[PDB]
Amino acid sequence: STGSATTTPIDSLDDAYITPVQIGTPAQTLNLDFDTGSSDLWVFSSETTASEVDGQTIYTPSKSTTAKLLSGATWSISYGDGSSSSGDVYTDTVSVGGLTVTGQAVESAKKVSSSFTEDSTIDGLLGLAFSTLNTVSPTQQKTFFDNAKASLDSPVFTADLGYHAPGTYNFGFIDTTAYTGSITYTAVSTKQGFWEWTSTGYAVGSGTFKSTSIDGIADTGTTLLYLPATVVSAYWAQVSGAKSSSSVGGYVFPCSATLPSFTFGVGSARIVIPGDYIDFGPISTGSSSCFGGIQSSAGIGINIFGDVALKAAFVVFNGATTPTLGFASK
């Protein structure tokens, strides 16, 4: 089997991408944030505290003839941005882009943190990291991909995120028309539960490539590119007037600037992030200070190849017995 679904930016900045997901019978379609940095499929629901729902579409398990309470199971998750959610668990039929999994754990939120409530466009998350990170207790549950894998034509999914435009998540096949050149594959460590890999270096604009190992994670659920402070300083030094602002929370730059590209290495291959992808717009409405899309990871503990990086590439998440990642230009 295969599946293919379009993923759509939630706003004009590509802050996140939503993909329609069918849950239950008859189908209830929710728009979920596919997140290769986490491993829970959780949704706003009829159980979510009413004051914490503000415009999201909810899953109502009592209206699904295939829903079953997973007795005794609870979940609770905290994300790297400080947001969180928790609740109970149903199993139900879940379909993405024509690919159907029966008995998928659907984690129904009883509580969500304010950042979720305040984002009416995201109805939940669909985790695509390794199932070892799933938070369901006392019986850990498998991700959608883990449940689907054995049925897929090939045990892979691909992320093809658009810049200010829709893109595609495919399951079970590699669309050879969706990228240019060849796909360069690179080793993955699953020891932290992430799609963790090592970039071979970077360049700023037309500058020389610096060969240096940068360990990080491929994370579709993170907006920006978070890299070591040395790398980030080297990038922003090429933008007149750019500076790190403690009050804003990162590097800002004059909105009048033209940003240089940023290149990262994948083995001997190179992925070029155009400068425009690094512009996240005014820090507040009407400001002439703009927020940068490359930020320091120093306070995180891990480097994160988020959407800024991934949307410059066609990315293969190869879930074979020994997982690997592939990157191609497009």
Side-chain angles (χ1 to χ4, degrees), residues 1-62 64-67 69-109 112-141 143-148 150-190 192-242 244-330:
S1 62
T2 64
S4 181
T6 298
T7 193
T8 300
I10 64 164
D11 62 24
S12 65
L13 296 177
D14 297 346
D15 281 318
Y17 298 79
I18 49 172
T19 309
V21 178
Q22 282 71 50
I23 308 176
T25 310
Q28 300 179 38
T29 298
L30 275 65
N31 296 328
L32 305 187
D33 185 351
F34 282 25
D35 179 14
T36 63
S38 68
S39 307
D40 289 48
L41 193 175
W42 74 260
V43 297
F44 279 79
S45 76
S46 58
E47 303 180 329
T48 308
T49 298
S51 63
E52 297 180 352
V53 184
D54 185 6
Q56 296 81 10
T57 295
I58 62 166
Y59 170 58
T60 303
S62 66
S64 173
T65 59
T66 42
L69 179 72
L70 186 61
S71 179
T74 59
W75 62 280
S76 180
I77 192 161
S78 304
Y79 295 102
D81 63 351
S83 65
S84 63
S85 54
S86 63
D88 57 14
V89 187
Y90 294 80
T91 57
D92 210 341
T93 301
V94 172
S95 299
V96 175
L99 169 65
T100 300
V101 167
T102 58
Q104 173 64 46
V106 177
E107 302 173 34
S108 165
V112 304
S113 64
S114 60
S115 67
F116 290 113
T117 299
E118 291 162 5
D119 183 3
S120 65
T121 71
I122 290 174
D123 302 324
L125 268 65
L126 189 150
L128 293 168
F130 292 87
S131 292
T132 55
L133 295 182
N134 177 265
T135 77
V136 176
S137 179
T139 306
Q140 189 171 66
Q141 300 295 303
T143 69
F144 175 81
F145 178 55
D146 221 330
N147 281 323
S151 303
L152 295 176
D153 292 355
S154 180
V156 305
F157 68 90
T158 64
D160 180 8
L161 301 180
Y163 167 66
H164 293 177
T168 305
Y169 283 103
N170 290 330
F171 292 84
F173 71 106
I174 291 165
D175 179 358
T176 62
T177 74
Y179 57 87
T180 63
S182 52
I183 306 177
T184 295
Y185 289 86
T186 196
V188 166
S189 173
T190 65
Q192 295 192 85
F194 300 123
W195 293 92
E196 188 172 357
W197 66 290
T198 301
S199 174
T200 50
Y202 70 97
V204 175
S206 60
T208 63
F209 187 83
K210 175 72 168 180
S211 293
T212 183
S213 294
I214 304 171
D215 299 334
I217 66 168
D219 185 2
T220 59
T222 290
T223 312
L224 306 186
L225 174 53
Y226 293 90
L227 293 173
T230 47
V231 178
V232 175
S233 180
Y235 178 79
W236 290 108
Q238 299 305 311
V239 179
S240 282
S244 183
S245 168
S246 54
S247 60
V248 174
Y251 281 88
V252 298
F253 66 94
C255 294
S256 60
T258 300
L259 297 181
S261 63
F262 183 88
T263 300
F264 63 94
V266 182
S268 54
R270 306 289 180 252
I271 300 294
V272 180
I273 305 171
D276 288 352
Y277 290 27
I278 299 160
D279 181 359
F280 280 75
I283 61 171
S284 293
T285 301
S287 180
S288 71
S289 185
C290 275
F291 197 68
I294 296 178
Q295 297 292 346
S296 178
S297 65
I300 297 175
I302 199 159
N303 300 305
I304 306 174
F305 294 87
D307 297 335
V308 164
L310 303 181
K311 74 190 176 183
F314 177 89
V315 187
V316 180
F317 295 79
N318 168 28
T321 302
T322 297
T324 65
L325 281 165
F327 292 81
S329 295
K330 64 187 184 190

